[PDB]
Design a protein around this ligand. Structure first.
Ligand SMILES: Cc1ncc(COP(=O)(O)O)c(C=O)c1O
Ligand SMILES: Cc1ncc(COP(=O)(O)O)c(C=O)c1O
Ligand SMILES: [Cl-]
Ligand SMILES: [Cl-]
Lengths: 386, 386
């Protein structure tokens, strides 16, 4: 089995991932391609192994949050295109060219200076660029028909840059009111008709995320960007109810009990503040996970774990590296038993959506804030490895 | 100055850590030594450089959460003693003996089997052991006067082990009501005077954390365990008001503005959900930090940052890698300005404790969940290095 000094770990099921990608393949047009999104350390699942696997089973490009996230992928052996979705400083232009990482950009001045920087070094490859159009998200990108015409011309003269795409982003595609998503769509096809009547040919167009591809597959165009659905999680409860694609969750979290005792002597106080007093014959177990791992402190006298197919509550305040649970009056448990924090055990289950609702947040934040000091194990074909 | 692809970062001031250690030395008896607590990546500040500095200025031993956190310290050169505060499985006995790590123990059968493992291998290293006594925390350790004497008996009968300390933990020593802290103390003295009426000689004795070394210095016995005080933060508002010792905070979090635009054309929505709508001459500025870095999604439409010595508010929902802020109806700023997120700027300040209050938690959690994908820079004698 699994041999650790501190006994807490994560398991990622790679057979779930490949299944999730087929379901999405068979929904969108045959003519469209898939860009796997693995930023923030693969949404907390580990970026290297999920990307490797995704590119074997349907995907052909990848997307990350920064140059540094992309360089980790090339050092692991990957030669596919890698797109950087945020903003990159002119200070990393030559190093992105060297590692062949694709960059987003949307200003005339940025393109002129990035061109001169590689001009003054010759001995270079050319730098590939996607243009970001802002149709309603308000974060990054260009916003008028004239501005965008200026940027396509500054890019077409620049001998060391090369134009490989143009995209946008919907801000409310997971919501049952489709008003603003459709208005974004026709703003975008507008700007592209203009560029065309000018005599300008187009590269790869992409605009959909998980929710958009499931709910508006006729917006697929050349490419889509698959993120949260790769990992078996739905963007919103609304999109799940539509019942159009069946996904399977890939992540679960576990530990082993560290100690078991009956509260006979006194005092019978438990954890900081002494917010919990046991009864003379209650049984209290101690487990090795805390808020510095990503288990929220606000779950103090409130959360659950699974022990032997049943839910036992958390007793007292959460601490930095450890929590206590109550097995009840004359409990039943041993040092060494296995406990489930997120996932399945026999019949019972505690899902990540259940925990996120209990904390007033979204499943996105619950997985991608899991500390890197927890070791990750991968299952593929029934067998474990790392 | 500093040059980054994605422009966000942490500054830790080691001149402040040094002043924090001196204030504590003068306040406690010269009899007693200081063990520095650097578990969980040095409460988020980075374990390696904080531990070096601390051993140079008054600490003589270290504490961590697990055998793996200690092995990172030994790989960087540190030869001081290191105690594991949590439970270590028997599968790591041989490994702890080889890297000279000290472990907590409190069970007769664990003692017995640990000693067998090293005997059945010859082993020239004796494994150092500290005994945990539970007087009111109800987390780990032995609970009755009788049963402590069995463990002491078994430890002495094991030639491959070595007894180098005995300790306990105060569960409410940061609270105006001192009832329970006097009772635990009384019980702990009882058990050790019971022990030394039987002939036994005792080793290093420690019970104090930051709070209890400040309010009850007559408890320092042989050694104290300094954790949150090291980083320049108070364990509670009450302890801070008693105005007995003066602490300076070490950690700041900064970024650089990525883009700037005024919301002239439509639509003027900002971020997911369209929860904020700009005015037609409002300036909106985009920052490269988000909830996967550890900036809570709960700060959506209600947190602040510092730009040019002012407070500016978050606009719309926090996203995974970026936030948006509003500069006002004709605000001023350029792509490139420096922004302070936790800390001090011009004359202004946003303290970690204000942010914790906003979220109904404690400063421990705010700092120890800052992500490892953010670079940490160190300033010592008013200058920087990494
Ligand atoms: C521009 C962009 N595309 C695609 C994605 C993936 O989004 P989702 O996880 O909702 O599929 C994200 C996040 C994003 O910011
Ligand atoms: C047993 C023990 N001792 C000492 C400390 C350090 O505590 P503090 O940061 O409150 O000083 C901790 C944490 C702990 O768990
Ligand atoms: Cl965007
Ligand atoms: Cl303890």
């Amino acid at each position: 089995m699994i041999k650790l000094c501190r006994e807490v770990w994560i398991e990622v099921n790679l057979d779930a991932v490949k299944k999730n990608l087929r379901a999405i393949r068979r929904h969108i047009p045959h003519k469209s391609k898939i860009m796997a999104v693995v930023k923030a350390n693969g949404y907390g699942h580990g970026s290297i192994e999920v990307a490797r696997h995704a590119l074997e089973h349907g995907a052909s490009e990848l997307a990350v949050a920064s140059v540094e996230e992309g360089i980790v992928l090339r050092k692991a052996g990957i030669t596919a295109p890698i797109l950087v979705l945020g903003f990159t400083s002119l200070s990393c232009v030559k190093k992105s060219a060297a590692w062949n990482i694709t960059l987003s950009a949307f200003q005339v001045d940025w393109m002129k200076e990035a061109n001169e920087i590689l001009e003054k070094e010759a001995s270079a490859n050319r730098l590939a660029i996607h243009i970001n159009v802002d149709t309603g998200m308000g974060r990054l990108g260009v916003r008028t028909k004239e501005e965008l015409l200026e940027v396509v011309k500054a890019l077409k003269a620049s001998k060391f840059l090369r134009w490989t795409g143009i995209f946008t982003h919907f801000s409310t595609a997971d919501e049952p009111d489709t008003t603003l998503t459709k208005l974004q769509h026709e703003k975008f096809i507008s700007f592209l008709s203009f560029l065309k009547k000018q005599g300008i040919e187009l590269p790869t167009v992409h605009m959909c995320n998980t929710a958009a591809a499931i709910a508006f597959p006729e917006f697929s165009a050349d490419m889509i960007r698959l993120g949260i659905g790769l990992y078996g999680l739905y963007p919103s409860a609304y999109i799940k109810q539509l019942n159009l694609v069946k996904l399977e969750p890939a992540l679960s979290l576990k530990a082993r009990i560290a100690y078991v005792k009956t509260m006979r002597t006194e005092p019978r106080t438990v954890s900081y503040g002494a917010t919990y007093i046991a009864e003379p014959n209650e049984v209290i177990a101690t487990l090795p996970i805390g808020y510095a791992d990503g288990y929220s402190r606000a779950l103090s006298n409130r959360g659950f774990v699974l022990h032997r197919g049943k839910r036992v509550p958390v007793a007292g305040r959460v601490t930095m590296d450890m929590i206590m649970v109550s097995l009840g009056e004359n409990g039943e448990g041993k040092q060494g038993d296995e406990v489930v924090i997120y996932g399945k055990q026999k019949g019972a289950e505690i899902s990540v959506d259940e925990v996120a609702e209990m904390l007033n947040t979204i499943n996105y934040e619950v997985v991608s804030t899991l500390s890197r000091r927890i070791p990750r194990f991968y299952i593929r074909d029934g067998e474990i490895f790392k």
